[PDB]
Amino acid sequence: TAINQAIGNLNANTQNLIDKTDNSPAYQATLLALKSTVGLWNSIAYAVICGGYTDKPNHNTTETFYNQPGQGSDSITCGGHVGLLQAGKNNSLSIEQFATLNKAYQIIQAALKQGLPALSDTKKTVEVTIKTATNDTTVSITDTFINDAQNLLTQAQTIINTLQDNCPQLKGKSNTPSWQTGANQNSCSVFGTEFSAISDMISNAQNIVQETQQLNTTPLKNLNSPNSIALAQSMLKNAQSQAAVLKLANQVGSDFNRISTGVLKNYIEECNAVSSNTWGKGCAGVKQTLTSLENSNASFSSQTPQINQAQNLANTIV
Amino acid sequence: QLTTESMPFNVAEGKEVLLLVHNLPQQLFGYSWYKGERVDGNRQIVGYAIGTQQATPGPANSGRETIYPNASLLIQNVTQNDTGFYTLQVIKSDLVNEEATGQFHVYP
Q1: How far is Cα B106 from Cα B108, in angstroms, rounded to an integer?
Q2: What is the distance between the alpha carbons of residues A137 and B41, in angstroms, rounded to a whole number?
Q3: In chain B, what residues touch A172 (CB-CB under 8 Å)?
Q4: CA distance linking residue A284 with residue A294, whole number of Å
């Protein structure tokens, strides 16, 4: 008996996390992980040191990645003289590693101007250019890329793993941001809790996406052990998964707060109107989305008892 | 101004020499030594990166040099080949670069 309303609740819930955007915890959490990643990179990027040799030392060659937030410039160039010293953990990124980052970066930017679609939507595509010179040589490619969470998170994951696994070193000084010394700093020391936090967010947003995925393809529509034990385990499964979602999204705000502790406390949420003058602040419109998530979480929390009932009924059949 | 200085300036064979550095900048990213009068990938003896406190030898390396953390460099058991010019490339923390050249003479 108490089913038919409980299902309506479980179903309506999915429609709302998956089709809606404005009030969706799942959506906003996902979007927050992407914005932050971008936000990270903008704040940091002008100071990461790329160019180590991987086979052999050399000061002659220098890649320029366009539409990057460097210091004076709207491009970053991966050093030539740095080329004299081996790329690796705690030193310097390789040019390759930077290129693979930049790709992932350009994709996420392109998809935000176009704007992340809803989670049920997997169709949406986006065009993205990637200009890169050498010294001379010059490559411009415009390719079509899926604009969906699933994928953009993978790009974010690409970005943060580059930083965490390689811990590049950071430029000295000589209006700068305040975490910048006159000496080199291992970016895993300085930005450790941001890397961990944004990483934790990406990684959580992924599970959101999964769970919503299976949830969406699994709508729902008597005696003692009369094969309605199924479609209770069913009902169970969905509720236990909607719970997971709401939890994870909450946790994405909580994961974000850790930064509001550490060094990019202020910078990651601020800007000046990619351009010459965007280095050193996140310039990704994070606040707006944070407060949008916080509210999604709050508003949806009113389902948290309906969901737990679903479970407790389910289990009493078993 | 960055500077180098062999000692001894003239070097007995089978013995050893030290190339001192002067005016090493305060704040470094790393630095490198080169057989030659010029900075050349394929003539690098060794590179030291601050971030990792590590010394990776380049192609030129005879496996008888030792670099130290104030940029100085030592060659032991010198051979006739070791004679010549030697060049120090230094990268500052803001990535401004600097070179200095020096030289020693071996005799049999």
Answers
A1: 7
A2: 21
A3: 27, 29, 92-95
A4: 18
How many CB atoms are closer than 10 A to CB A201? Answer: 30
- How many contacts, defined by CB atoms under 8 Å, are there between A and B? 81
Q: A25 vs chain B: nearest CA distance in angstroms?
A: 41
Residues of B in contact with A174 (CB under 8 A): 94
Q: What is the resolution of this structure in A?
A: 2.6
A83, closest residue in chain B (CA to CA): B41
Nearest CA-CA distance, residue A193 and chain B, Å: 20
For residue B7, the enclosing domain spans 1-108
Structure tokens at A85: 């010293």
How many whole angstroms separate alpha carbon A226 and alpha carbon A214?
A: 26
Going from N- to C-terminal start, the domains of chain A cover 1-318
**Is A120:A26 a contact under the CB 8 Å cutoff?**
no
Q: Which residues of B touch A53 (CB under 8 A)?
A: 41
The closest alpha carbon to A248, from A299, A210, A303, belongs to A210
Q: What is residue A296's three-state secondary structure?
A: helix
Burial class (CB in 10 A: 0-12, 13-18, 19+), A120: middle
- Residue A46 is classified by DSSP as G
Six token digits for residue A184: 């080199």
Residue A180: closest CA among chain B residues belongs to which residue?
Answer: B94
> Is residue A27 a contact partner of residue A33, using CB atoms and an 8 Å limit?
no
Chain position carrying tokens 């380049």: B58
Facing residue for A184 by CB, picked from B44, B50, B59:
B50
CA pair distance B88, A14, nearest whole angstrom: 65
Q: Which residues of A touch B25 (CB under 8 A)?
A: none
CB-nearest to B44 from A49, A57, A81 is A57
Nearest CA to A49 out of A14, A10, A104, A91 is that of A91
Structure determination technique employed: X-ray
Number of domains in chain B: 1
